[PDB]
Design a protein around this ligand. Structure first.
Ligand SMILES: CCCCCCCCCCCCCCCCCC(=O)OC[C@H](COP(=O)([O-])OCC(O)COP(=O)([O-])OC[C@@H](COC(=O)CCCCCCCCCCCCCCCCC)OC(=O)CCCCCCCCCCCCCCCCC)OC(=O)CCCCCCCCCCCCCCCCC
Ligand SMILES: CCCCCCCCCCCCCCCCCC(=O)OC[C@H](COP(=O)([O-])OCC(O)COP(=O)([O-])OC[C@@H](COC(=O)CCCCCCCCCCCCCCCCC)OC(=O)CCCCCCCCCCCCCCCCC)OC(=O)CCCCCCCCCCCCCCCCC
Ligand SMILES: CCCCCCCCCCCCCCCCCC(=O)OC[C@H](COP(=O)([O-])OCC[N+](C)(C)C)OC(=O)CCCCCCCCCCCCCCCCC
Ligand SMILES: CCCCCCCCCCCCCCCCCC(=O)OC[C@H](COP(=O)([O-])OCC[N+](C)(C)C)OC(=O)CCCCCCCCCCCCCCCCC
Ligand SMILES: CCCCCCCCCCCCCCCCCC(=O)OC[C@H](COP(=O)([O-])OCC[N+](C)(C)C)OC(=O)CCCCCCCCCCCCCCCCC
Ligand SMILES: CCCCCCCCCCCCCCCCCC(=O)OC[C@H](COP(=O)(O)OCCN)OC(=O)CCCCCCCCCCCCCCCCC
Ligand SMILES: CCCCCCCCCCCCCCCCCC(=O)OC[C@H](COP(=O)(O)OCCN)OC(=O)CCCCCCCCCCCCCCCCC
Ligand SMILES: CCCCCCCCCCCCCCCCCC(=O)OC[C@H](COP(=O)(O)OCCN)OC(=O)CCCCCCCCCCCCCCCCC
Ligand SMILES: CCCCCCCCCCCCCCCCCC(=O)OC[C@H](COP(=O)(O)OCCN)OC(=O)CCCCCCCCCCCCCCCCC
Ligand SMILES: CCCCCCCCCCCCCCCCCC(=O)OC[C@H](COP(=O)(O)OCCN)OC(=O)CCCCCCCCCCCCCCCCC
Lengths: 98, 347, 316, 101, 168, 83, 70, 98, 114
């Protein structure tokens, strides 16, 4: 591939592992989710710019617009979780076991 | 919720799924999924209670993670082939993430732990959308990229789904959880025949949607969500118990009902490819599904459970629920075996 | 020589900010029938120097901040970004000749909200946080109109290059074809920089976020805030009051362009002395219910007006 | 390299003033002194984000006016701005832009 | 050492990810994600993407990340695991950097090279325009379908969030 | 005829800002259709030569393609010099 | 009186004039008495680099005219 | 597509950005326009089962222009050999390479 | 695979046109109306052959016409031209509209002399 791709590709892996291992806060994981889209944004832009894929120069912007809209929907749920149990801890969200 | 906003949100759930099915570009496929997840959360939060809030959160995190993996597969596929077309992927690593992203969205084992819990925390009408409509979009993509899916991966996810759906359903009394595990079990059949004959993936999907929609509709009519509450139906609407018996027997694959057709055709398309061990193991493990279906038939229609005194006040009012297409769905769920050769319309 | 160029831009900026404090205190004084500083040096010309030394040899507080690292990051970010917004300004030749300079200034300006948010956290006071949240909500709300208005003006210019705005106004000021946008741009710059009648932070009896700062750290927030007041008024003059550029006598441009930039900075001091203060719910309604409907409508008008007159500017 | 030096100088200068500000008066020796989530604020931030994203789709308009398909370009440009105004109307009528409990 | 600016930035890019991936307090986690975003724009700028790079600052850092920090300060109530994860992350980064700088070839899932990013740049360009800018401006002439679906999704985002946050 | 006047004169008194916004937006959607100069915008955009005009191999039957830039054949920008 | 406010304005005015005056002069000093070349687009950069090779001295601003042509 | 609505209605919703050799604004080509064109014209109409065997030569060239894997191996070999001879006194770079 | 064939260092040698971009940009309009024929043959060669090794001989012809084009200016209109590109060279953007007065003299000189 190339030398830069290794770190971008390894940055996605770090964020994925970070998202799959919650500690206590729900806000912490949403950041790991928005880190993933940042790595995908940079990785796609590197590919498109280097190959002179002109019409694909708009794709990274579309990736950013939808990923931010999804992030907004994520924060709204976090707020409604905090207004119920007083904190954004994931251990509280355990009613559905039974 | 305002009625007009309810229609608008529903049409956006449909539009998201339609965009996936009419798109020749991976970006529009991804946009289709995003528009679909954005619109379905409000119908899960509509009852405004902690359980709904928890269910919507567990669904968002699962579907958000799945969409990120899918977009990672698309970019890897762009690097190694320089195109966006919705077809076979050109990198084995892209195929694995793509296959795993779709598995998470579908709810296949071992990416299954959210289906019982999300379906339990939302109303019956929201569960009907979740278990029937939300399965169309991922299956459309699998129909198109199956030539490059890793055989050992797709067949391994199929086998686990059949097992975990079977064992999970035995230990349930809540109706919403029983359908959730029933949904996991039937997914394994659809993806087991996919490498061999994708036409039978659609047939099993169509039949599953018809049968599943019939069950949820009958539960919604009597507002029943637990096994016991369903056992009072014989004393309120006797006809509805005979329809539940017939559909439950159909879902179990017992001939001569409709639910035997997909299990019949999938076993045919696998023995043609010299696959004998897998269809037998799949068919035998499906008896677990027939068991906890039969248990509901014993407490609903074949025995008369205890009733309560206040039930007598219900006899004086009719059913004002919509029960849309219930007469048509129930007949299609039971009396379609003589029309099996009609599956060619799906080719 | 470039390093000399940077210092020839930074030091004069700080000196200009130092003597803007004096000019503000004296213009306000004469509009109030008094004088202002005229004892510390002739006509108060040494007043800025006395204030600087006094603050930098006064003991700082540094309370028991929850972090103690955001407390030091906030003033670095505020002052660091404030000086960075000057490097692409054509006066008439930029220090850095960016192709997307107008977009660079929007990007760097939207990062100044962090210093407001971080200093709220560091104070460790629950009430000081509420004041920071109101200030942040004000800044982001009014940079919606900065972005759309700027886009509308650039449709008559053709690029994001800041020096192309000089060519665009080589026959006529843009204040004439776009005065309605200039009005809402001028007011939007007051709200961004927390200036009266939009200074709820400094508007005691309702709240500020930089209350726990004293001595040097307080002066750093002050210097950054006033350098943004000069910068935004330099941006306005370039945008709406273009000055003709003669390549053989560039100093002629700088003198005329400086006079306009001063007159617009004095207008900020003029407006502070004349009006009472907006309520928090009232400046939000001034944006979401009055400016935004007009800004969106004028954006539609300015996308179509060049097309229907055959007046689309060149790309280059 | 020029833009890199300019950023280095500005932030390096700001750091120096900050540290010498926290130490210059400490060259002096003064005796030791001793001794609710709001929903409307959140909705302002979210409304700004969705509006801010729609602005991202409008920034390339000046370049989009250089095309040979002005009829198509002018149709979509007025569609995005009209849709942005529809969002404002929905919040306005649904009491989104209010500060009274 | 200025020829390897892109690789140096990428190394800082990863270190920031290990910062907030270890999940310190949300205040510091968001701080680390701002650093990675700024470094991320730096990489995109050096590949010829100026509009895309600046769009990161305006929309990602000055947009979403401000809402993240704004919501953290209002709904977050301002360990060994954090340090353990953070130290584990840096070591893997060091070894990946160490090997790609020793033999200039590393095989982890993919075959990566270590010559330098500059070796794949295009060698010819004499246009009177920016190729990146032309593509993005095509959103209005070619991307009619993209504009409609993107705009509708943003409009539905407004409707959906108000429904979720009403609470009654 | 009287209903509209009563309605228009009331928004003009209570909501002058909104009345201005809709009037301005309404003109942005209507005038381009009726404007006779909208056709010159496309012609100006098509006339701008970003690319190189690659020449065509001569076969003999091409009387509409000039052999030299200064020949009278081919598209002319005379209309632009007068606009 | 009001004109006693001017001396503060003159100092503030002079400090805003130095950055503009300095950049214009430094460019001319460093570019052989001409304005600094502006290269926003690849074509302009290509010509400037070509001028660097044609100058003999590795400087973009040393122009060679007809006297350099045989 | 699962449903070929675009072909039925003859409307180009998203086929304009699928490949990098399609029509680009101002006729700007991608770096691998020639290679993509050759592979597309080789594999057209014969299904992907055959194209995986009867158009392998073109595909390998296309993938070589995308990631440039083979070229970087060759340059890497030359650099090592020159470096090895450099630290033995056995090589002398010419004046125009220094 | 095969071996990439390259021309020899003596097959590429030619008399260069060593004049700055301001000199070219001042004579661009007259240059394109005089050397059109050798120029367009070379460009037709490039867009058809798609290989720079196939159009080297056409390339040398392009150089020769430019050298001969500038010599004629060197003979008849030297001071007017030297004063034209000196004004073009002064602006950072090399604008035509800043030097209309000097353009007329050079334009008129070539009209009478050539
Ligand atoms: C062959 C395949 C055959 C299988 C077909 C299966 C259809 C079975 C549908 C379930 C029966 C309806 C029912 O019992 O009501 C439940 C429920 C109402 O019960 P509720 O929970 O008390 O009320 C909910 C709110 O409180 C709302 O309360 P409200 O008072 O505010 O009312 C809002 C308004 C709202 O009125 C509407 O519902 C109209 C909305 C437009 C529907 C789309 C129209 C399609 C044409 C345009 C394209 O009125 C209603 O809700 C009417 C009650 C619902 C009856 C109408 C349902 C029509 C479904 C048939 C069309 C199927 C298209 C897919 C469904 C959408 C997928 C997300 O209505 C639903 O939301 C069911 C949604 C259906 C999802 C499953 C669709 C099947 C998926 C397979 C599709 C075929 C591919 C294979
Ligand atoms: C292609 C030809 C398809 C023919 C479709 C025409 C019937 C659809 C309109 C009937 C209707 O209003 O409800 C449909 C639909 C379902 O409502 P429903 O509760 O199932 O209808 C039964 C009620 O008892 C209905 O009782 P009702 O008292 O409320 O209304 C009486 C209804 C009576 O109309 C009926 O006959 C309803 C039953 C018609 C059959 C419904 C299924 C549609 C055909 C499915 C074919 C499946 C083929 C499977 C073949 C497999 C083997 C090859 O008369 C009409 O409304 C006809 C209006 C003419 C327009 O209502 C809607 O929400 C959409 C309107
Ligand atoms: C450092 C201290 C923190 C600085 C915060 C501010 C970041 C500066 C903005 C980045 C530069 C920029 O905007 O480029 C626009 C401008 C856009 O200019 P342009 O698009 O007009 O193109 C210039 C050249 N032409 C016109 C010929 C094509 O970029 C440039 O001009 C040159 C690019 C240089 C790229 C080098 C970037 C390295 C530094 C990035 C890392 C930043 C780390 C931030 C740390 C986290 C804090 C947020
Ligand atoms: C209502 C309260 C707020 C309003 C703020 C008012 C202050 C902003 C400045 C308004 C007055 C405009 C500046 C006048 C002094 C400028 C001096 C100057 O540049 O030369 C005179 C300038 C000289 O013009 P010029 O040098 O700016 O170039 C003009 C550009 N063309 C040729 C395209 C029109 O002319 C005047 O302003 C005379 C008045
Ligand atoms: C042919 C096609 C033509 C198309 C274009 C036609 C345009 C026609 C004119 C349209 C109106 C013009 C827009 C003006 C802006 C209106 C904004 C607005 O919202 O007004 C109502 C707003 C508020 O209106 P309101 O508070 O009275 O009430 C609003 C409506 N109700 C009653 C329902 C609440 O006014 C304000 O903006 C308040 C001003 C705050 C204090 C500002 C201090 C002013 C200091 C003087 C500065 C002078 C400007 C300096 C500019 C210098 C620039 C270099
Ligand atoms: C000459 C002919 C000119 C055209 C005719 C004029 C236009 C008619 C419409 C103008 C009247 C609008 C209706 C109205 O009066 O709204 C008032 C109401 C204010 O309510 P409120 O402020 O909350 O009350 C406070 C009391 N204490 O407000 C409301 O309740 C809702 C107001 C919503 C406004 C939405 C603004 C977004 C649209 C911006 C304009 C962009 C263009 C739109 C697209 C146009 C396409 C052609
Ligand atoms: C590939 C390499 C992967 C393994 C690297 C291990 C990195 C983690 C370092 C260990 C660690 O995180 O700390 C111990 C861990 C959690 O930390 P702990 O001290 O237990 O916090 C609560 C104490 N009361 O304690 C644990 O619970 C163990 C967690 C698994 C390690
Ligand atoms: C570190 C130790 C290691 O090398 O593990 C590699 C392991 C197997 O991969 P393999 O290609 O067989 O190893 C190369 C041997 N010559 O594979 C691994 O353990 C790597 C784990 C990667 C986890 C992937 C998670 C999904 C994200 C996929 C995106 C691509 C990320 C991998 C490529 C970038 C490298 C980090
Ligand atoms: C073809 C392409 C263009 C297609 C555009 C279609 C989309 C339009 C998007 C517009 C933006 C969304 C705004 C929609 C909301 C309209 C306002 C509203 O919500 O109604 C609230 C208002 C409340 O009524 P109330 O306050 O109780 O009493 C006084 C009311 N005047 O109730 C009312 O009485 C308001 C009356 C309805 C408002 C009608 C607005 C019409 C605007 C068109 C004007 C065009 C004129 C242009 C010609 C100008 C010539 C100078
Ligand atoms: C005092 C009453 C009014 C109130 C104050 C008004 C505001 C302050 C005035 C506006 C700010 C201007 C500040 C600068 C004024 C002093 C400098 C000056 O007048 O111009 C000097 C300038 C320098 O000449 P120079 O650039 O070196 O030319 C060399 C060519 N070989 O010579 C030139 O070339 C000029 C052309």
């Amino acid at each position: 591939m190339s030398m830069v791709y290794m770190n971008i590709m390894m940055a996605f892996t770090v964020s994925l592992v970070g998202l799959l291992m919650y500690r206590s806060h729900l806000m912490s994981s949403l950041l790991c989710l928005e880190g993933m889209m940042l790595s995908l944004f940079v990785m796609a832009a590197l590919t498109i710019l280097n190959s002179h894929f002109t019409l694909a120069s708009m794709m990274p912007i579309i990736l950013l617009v939808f990923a931010a809209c999804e992030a907004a929907l994520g924060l709204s749920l976090l707020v409604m979780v905090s207004n119920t149990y007083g904190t954004d801890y994931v251990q509280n969200l355990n009613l559905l076991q039974c | 919720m305002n009625p007009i906003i309810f229609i608008i949100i529903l049409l956006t759930i449909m539009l998201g799924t339609i965009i996936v099915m009419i798109s020749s570009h991976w970006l529009l496929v991804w946009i289709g999924f995003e528009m679909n997840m954005l619109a379905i959360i409000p119908i899960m939060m509509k009852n405004h209670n902690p359980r709904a809030t928890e269910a919507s959160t567990k669904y968002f995190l699962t579907q958000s993670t799945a969409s990120m993996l899918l977009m990672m597969a698309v970019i890897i596929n762009l690097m190694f082939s320089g195109q966006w077309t919705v077809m076979k992927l050109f990198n084995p690593m892209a195929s694995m993430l793509m296959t795993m992203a779709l598995a998470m969205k579908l709810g296949m084992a071992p990416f299954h732990f959210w289906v019982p819990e999300v379906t339990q925390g939302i109303p019956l009408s929201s569960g009907l959308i979740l278990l029937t409509w939300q399965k169309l979009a991922p299956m459309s993509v699998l129909y198109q990229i199956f030539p490059s899916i890793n055989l050992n991966l797709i067949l391994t996810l199929s086998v686990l789904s059949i097992l975990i759906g079977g064992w999970g359903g035995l230990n349930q009394t809540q109706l919403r959880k029983i359908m959730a595990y029933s949904s996991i079990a039937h997914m394994g059949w659809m993806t087991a025949v996919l490498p061999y004959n994708p036409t039978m993936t659609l047939l099993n999907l169509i039949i599953y949607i018809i049968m599943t929609s019939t069950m949820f509709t009958m539960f919604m009519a009597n507002s029943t969500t637990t096994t016991l509450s369903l056992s009072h139906t014989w004393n309120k609407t006797p006809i509805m118990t005979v329809l539940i018996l017939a559909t439950l027997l159909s879902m179990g694959g017992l001939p001569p009902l409709s639910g035997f057709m997909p299990k019949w055709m999938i076993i045919q398309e696998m023995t043609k490819n010299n696959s004998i061990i897998l269809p037998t193991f799949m068919a035998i493990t499906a008896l677990l599904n027939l068991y906890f279906y039969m248990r509901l038939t014993y407490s609903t229609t074949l025995t008369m459970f205890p009733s309560t005194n206040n039930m007598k006040m219900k006899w004086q009012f009719p059913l004002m629920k919509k029960m849309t297409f219930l007469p048509t769905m129930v007949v299609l769920s039971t009396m379609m075996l003589p029309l099996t050769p009609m599956l060619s319309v799906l080719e | 020589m470039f390093m000399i160029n940077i210092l020839m831009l930074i030091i004069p900026i700080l000196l200009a900010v130092a003597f803007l404090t004096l000019v503000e205190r004296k213009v306000l004084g004469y509009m109030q029938l008094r004088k202002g500083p005229n004892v510390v040096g002739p006509y108060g010309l040494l007043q800025p120097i006395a204030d600087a030394i006094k603050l930098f040899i006064k003991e700082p507080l540094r309370p028991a901040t929850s972090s103690a690292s955001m407390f030091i990051l906030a003033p670095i970010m505020a002052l660091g970004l404030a000086l960075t917004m000057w490097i692409p300004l054509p006066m008439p030749y930029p220090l850095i000749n960016m192709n997307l300079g107008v977009l660079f200034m929007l990007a760097m300006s939207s990062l100044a909200v962090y210093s407001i948010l971080w200093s709220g956290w560091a104070s460790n006071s629950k009430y000081a946080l509420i004041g920071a949240l109101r200030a942040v909500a004000q800044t982001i709300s009014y940079e919606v109109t900065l972005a759309i208005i700027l886009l509308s003006v650039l449709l008559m210019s053709g690029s994001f290059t800041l020096s192309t705005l000089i060519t665009t106004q080589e026959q006529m000021w843009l204040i004439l074809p776009a005065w309605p946008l200039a009005m809402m741009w001028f007011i939007s710059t007051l709200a961004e920089t927390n200036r009266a009648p939009f200074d709820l932070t400094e508007g005691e009896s309702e709240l500020g976020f930089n209350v726990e700062y004293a001595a040097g750290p307080f002066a750093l927030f002050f210097m950054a805030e006033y350098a943004n007041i000069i910068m935004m008024n330099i941006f306005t003059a370039i945008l709406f009051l273009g000055t003709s550029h003669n390549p053989h006598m560039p100093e002629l441009y700088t003198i005329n362009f400086t006079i306009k930039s001063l007159l617009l900075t004095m207008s900020f001091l003029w407006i502070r002395a004349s009006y009472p203060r907006f309520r928090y719910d009232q400046l939000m309604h001034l944006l979401w219910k009055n400016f935004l409907p007009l800004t969106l409508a004028l954006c539609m008008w300015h996308v179509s007006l060049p097309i229907l007159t055959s007046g689309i500017p060149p790309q280059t | 390299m020029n833009l890199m030096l300019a950023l280095l100088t500005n932030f390096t200068l700001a750091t120096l003033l900050v540290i010498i500000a926290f130490w210059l008066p400490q060259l002096n020796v003064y005796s030791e002194k001793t001794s609710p989530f709001s929903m409307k604020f959140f909705l302002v931030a979210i409304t700004f984000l969705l509006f801010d994203l729609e602005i991202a789709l409008l920034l390339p308009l000046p370049w989009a006016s250089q095309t040979a398909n002005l009829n198509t370009m002018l149709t979509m440009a007025l569609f995005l701005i009209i849709l942005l105004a529809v969002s404002l109307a929905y919040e306005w009528t649904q009491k989104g832009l209010e500060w009274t409990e | 050492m200025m020829l390897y600016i892109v690789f140096i930035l990428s190394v800082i890019f990863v270190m920031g990810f290990v910062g907030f991936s270890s999940k310190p307090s949300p205040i510091y986690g968001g701080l680390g994600l701002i650093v990675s975003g700024g470094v991320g724009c730096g990489i995109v700028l050096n590949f010829g993407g100026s509009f895309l790079g600046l769009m990161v600052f305006l929309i990602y850092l000055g947009g979403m990340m401000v809402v993240f920090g704004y919501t953290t300060a209002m709904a977050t109530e301002q360990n060994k695991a954090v340090l353990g994860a953070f130290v584990t992350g840096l070591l893997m980064e060091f070894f990946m950097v160490y090997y790609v700088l020793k033999d200039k070839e590393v095989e982890v899932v993919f075959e990566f090279n270590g010559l330098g990013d500059w070796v794949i740049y295009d060698t010819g360009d004499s246009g009177f325009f920016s190729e990146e800018a032309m593509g993005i401006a095509a959103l209005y002439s070619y991307g009619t379908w993209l504009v409609i679906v993107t705009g509708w999704s943003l409009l539905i985002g407004v409707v959906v969030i108000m429904e979720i946050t009403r609470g009654n | 005829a009287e209903r509209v006047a009563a309605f228009l004169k009331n928004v003009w008194a209570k909501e002058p800002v909104l009345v201005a916004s809709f009037a301005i937006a309404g003109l942005a959607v209507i005038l381009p259709t009726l404007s006779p100069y909208t056709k010159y915008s496309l012609m100006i955009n098509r006339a701008t030569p970003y690319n190189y005009p690659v020449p065509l191999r001569d076969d003999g039957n091409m009387p509409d393609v000039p052999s030299h830039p200064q020949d009278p054949q081919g598209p002319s920008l005379e209309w632009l010099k007068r606009l | 009186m009001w004109f006693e406010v001017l001396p503060g304005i003159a100092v503030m005015g002079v400090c805003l004039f130095i950055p503009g005056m300095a950049t214009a002069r430094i460019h001319r000093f460093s570019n052989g008495g001409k304005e600094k070349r502006v290269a926003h687009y690849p074509y302009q950069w290509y010509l400037m680099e070509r001028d660097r090779r044609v100058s003999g001295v590795n400087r973009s601003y040393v122009s060679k005219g007809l006297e350099n042509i045989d | 597509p699962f449903f070929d609505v675009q072909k039925r209605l003859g409307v180009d919703l998203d086929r304009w950005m699928t490949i990098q050799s399609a029509e680009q604004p101002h006729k700007i080509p991608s770096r691998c326009h020639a290679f993509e064109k050759e592979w597309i014209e080789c594999a057209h109409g014969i299904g992907s089962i055959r194209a995986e065997k009867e158009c392998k030569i073109e595909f390998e060239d296309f993938r070589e222009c995308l990631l440039r894997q083979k070229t970087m191996k060759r340059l890497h070999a030359i650099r090592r050999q020159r470096e090895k001879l450099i630290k033995e006194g056995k090589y002398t770079p010419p004046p125009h390479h220094s | 695979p095969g071996i990439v064939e390259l021309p020899s260092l003596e097959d590429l040698k030619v008399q260069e046109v060593k004049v700055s971009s301001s000199v070219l940009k001042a004579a661009a309009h007259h240059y394109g109306a005089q050397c059109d024929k050798p120029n367009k043959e070379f460009m037709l060669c490039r867009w058809e052959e798609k290989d720079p090794r196939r159009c080297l001989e056409e390339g040398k012809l392009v150089n020769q016409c430019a050298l001969e084009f500038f010599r004629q200016i060197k003979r008849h209109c030297a001071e007017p031209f030297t004063e034209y590109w000196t004004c073009i060279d002064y602006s950072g953007l090399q604008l035509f509209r800043r030097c209309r007065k000097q353009q007329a003299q050079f334009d008129e000189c070539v009209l009478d002399k050539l």
